[PDB]
Nucleic acid binder design. Sequence first.
RNA 1: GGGACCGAGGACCGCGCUCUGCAAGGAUGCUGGCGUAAUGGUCACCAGCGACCCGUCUUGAAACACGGACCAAGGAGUCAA
RNA 2: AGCGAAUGAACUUUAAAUAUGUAAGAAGCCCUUGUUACUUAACUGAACGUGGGCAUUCGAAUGUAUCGACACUAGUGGGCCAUUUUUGGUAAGCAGAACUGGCGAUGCGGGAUGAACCGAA
Lengths: 52, 126, 62, 174, 50, 99
Amino acid sequence: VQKKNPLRNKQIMLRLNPYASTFAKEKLGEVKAEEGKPPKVPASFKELLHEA
Amino acid sequence: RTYRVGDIVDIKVNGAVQKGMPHKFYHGKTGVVYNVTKSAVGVIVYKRVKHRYIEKRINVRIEHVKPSRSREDFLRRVKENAELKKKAKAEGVPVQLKRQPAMPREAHTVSIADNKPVTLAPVAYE
Amino acid sequence: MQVYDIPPLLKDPSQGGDATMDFLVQVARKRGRLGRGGVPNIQAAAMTVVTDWRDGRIQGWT
Amino acid sequence: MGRLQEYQVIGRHLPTEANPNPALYRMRIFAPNEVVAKSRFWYFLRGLKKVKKATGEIVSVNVISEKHPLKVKNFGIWLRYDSRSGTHNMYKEYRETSRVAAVEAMYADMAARHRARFRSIHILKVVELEKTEDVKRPYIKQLVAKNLSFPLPHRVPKISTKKIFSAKRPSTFS
Amino acid sequence: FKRAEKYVKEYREQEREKIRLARIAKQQGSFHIPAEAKLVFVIRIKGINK
Amino acid sequence: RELIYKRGYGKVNGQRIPLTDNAIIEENLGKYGIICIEDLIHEIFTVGPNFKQAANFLWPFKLSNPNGGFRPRKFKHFIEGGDLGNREEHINALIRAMN
RNA sequence: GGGACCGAGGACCGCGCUCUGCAAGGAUGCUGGCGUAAUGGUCACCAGCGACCCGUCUUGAAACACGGACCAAGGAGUCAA
RNA sequence: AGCGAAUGAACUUUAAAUAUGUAAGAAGCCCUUGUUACUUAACUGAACGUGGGCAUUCGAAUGUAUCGACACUAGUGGGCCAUUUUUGGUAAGCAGAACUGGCGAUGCGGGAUGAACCGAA
């Protein structure tokens, strides 16, 4: 009878996508990056970046 | 050169012979032979007016006509697919028998060793 | 799921009666076997899976 | 030409059987965004070599940020521009903070004095002048004078444009 | 529910894989060239006069 | 995602039917393996073998005019300060305004 | 969080969910004044903005040219072979 | 572009820009064999077919708000302007050809104004 937007209506989004509840509860839009010591930029890369 | 009624010919219009030469619109054309005479060949060509195509009949001599190979790609494919299909059924795996358009290139890495990049100015001074 | 992806099968009434109809569709998706209108080649996808099983592409034991 | 950024664009001709591991050329391009920097790369490479977008690919595009965007520098820009007569040479100096800001200052300057367009200006060299004696133009020379200090005569105050009527007349001293 | 579970995981893994490959090329000295895009959205913005 | 969820309509017997149910996706693209919205979104984004059937099933998207306008003059190419042509990821800024 | 415009259908059925029912196949609940020119409508006039005088003929088109003082009644593709 | 390939627009390994002709399978086939007054030294070839299969991507993409044939009926059968390509000439004008677009049957926004401009039906 009328088209209801799933971006604005939470009930329509759960009708079309039942994982939208688990997406919000587990905060899958806010996943942190994996751990690890980030290794430095190699010196050859910086010299080419500032070559001229 | 021997021509048969019904084959596909290409009109080139050589400038050595001024007899039997068609118009410049019919130069560099391609049509189907409907009539063969002693020295001239009648070729049916297509010409577009606004949206449709009006078929026109022109008499072109032997010195301006040559065979084409546009069909030859189609018959080359019809045997190549035939042998491939028989060879596929012989050992029993499917093969993509179609030709597909060129796809975007996949990801790859390029090493910088031995190929250090050269910097270039907008205009060359040397 | 780790080999040919296969997003999970709709089970339908009963178990295995219609699930492996959907499995042949999903395998033909990942292989790329369709129709003129796009209808997947379920039978060629099935003979692909059997051939891959004969070659040892899928692990399994009793 | 907007808030320009320096880009390091590296591109090469497509690898073939006759010539695998191709030449790998590199340019520095001042462009408003990523997409313009690729286009200026292939435009400049087309004039120099026979490498176009159809037979070439982009290897890397990186942004060259300033080392010290808080230190005042004297820059020298050597450029060619095209007029109705032909192609000419200039060397102009700009007292700025970043290499991109000197290029923005150059484009507005060439549009103002000489009515030059972005399509006619070729930037050949942007050089930071390390020493004070390297400055050659008198408008930069008076800026690098020892104990430089000046007043600001006739300063019109910032009055809001919706304040149509004022009660007392403004002053232009402070 | 399980189809949408594996789609979200795949999108995250595909995004991280492009970053990791670009990182491991930069530290090995090389350049990683990402794949040319397979999808394009075309919007018509001009009238059909002339 | 926003285009399919908000402006997504289907060709069902030559008619423009909004995608308000997962059922009408299954009646039309269920033989291709597509049974819900997320499979339709997965197929367009990760370009699969059934892209031709899924893209043709979608009615062409009737976007509105962008919020904030195009540019001062929009009939030049994007690489000379216009709007026509190819833009890498700036089409996402255009799609956000037209949605 | 702050606004604007709209309430389309008329027992139930469907797709779903935050569950003694819900925001889920289109607005209900509570309250006030008036119950008559109050809303609404029709003319006359002022105000803001818009707006060549009709028909015929020619031509790619205009322009020229022709008819037009006003009203009532009559007035032009019919019949036969 | 090269002539650290040969040779010398009329040179080429390669190859633009810009439009353009033709072909892309079920009507094609392939395998077995029937006719012919065509053809061949000849159960040799050419045409039409019978029997099996390629019917699930059946042999590029994209679209498809259907397409073809026969019979019948009405209005039409003038051009103007512009882009691009091309031919000829003049002191300068200008004259011809091909494609395409606009106007003729088209209202609306803009260019103060409006047959030929921009935007958009």
